[PDB]
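### Sample
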Amino acid sequence: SHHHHHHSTDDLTDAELAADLAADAGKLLLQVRAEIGFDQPWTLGEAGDRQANSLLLRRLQAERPGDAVLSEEAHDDLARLKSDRVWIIDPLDGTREFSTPGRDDWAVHIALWRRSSNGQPEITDAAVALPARGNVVYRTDTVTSGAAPAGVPGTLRIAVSATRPPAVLHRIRQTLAIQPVSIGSAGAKAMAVIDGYVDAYLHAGGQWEWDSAAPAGVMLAAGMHASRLDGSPLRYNQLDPYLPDLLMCRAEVAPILLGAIADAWR
Ligand code: NA
């Protein structure tokens, strides 16, 4: 729709652009999936990440030529460290899931980091697409707050995905009734929290910035919780863009889980 340039496609707000980029990459990923098919999963996953990255860098160049870009799929020249505006993107989160027939738990992550003196809310705008799920795009400018708790009281559903369960989860399951819910891709795990399909998404051991920046942005915009496991803020555009761990969860469950994590270390 035709509109006036936002106060303070061409002429999108940053959140609009994040959403449009996520949707466009999502469509391309769906095209690649259809074209290549599933008989060679390695090749499928590689073609998808490579082509989605090309689309995203091309369009960020065109529509935001002054902004820096940290992409999972591109070399990192560290110019971003000097920038006040940095896109943190994963063109394809969940290559295994993308390359498996029938699975829809893979995502595209598009996040804008903006330099903040005080307030520290670094990811200002973001979108997560789940292309196989009707190409739904979750966006910081439309997600809503106040979601009503869905599960049986006294039991937590927690999205996790790992080649092996972390020790901290073993410990907190001694004290809290938890059902681990196996979902692929960081993006799908996080959006399950937004959806109310699970109560929390927990990750121990490292994760790259591009797989949590967009989910975290959307989570905070929805009034939910996103932090390190020790409760300190997630930091982005770091020299080493790697987060040792994280918790995203609905607001009501944050104190219980942060508490259990802290008590684990006793
Ligand atoms: Na990727």
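Strands lie at 68-71, 85-93, 107-114, 123-130, 136-139, 156-160, 178-182, 200-208, 225-227, 242-249. This sample (3'-phosphoadenosine 5'-phosphate phosphatase) is used throughout the tutorial notebook.
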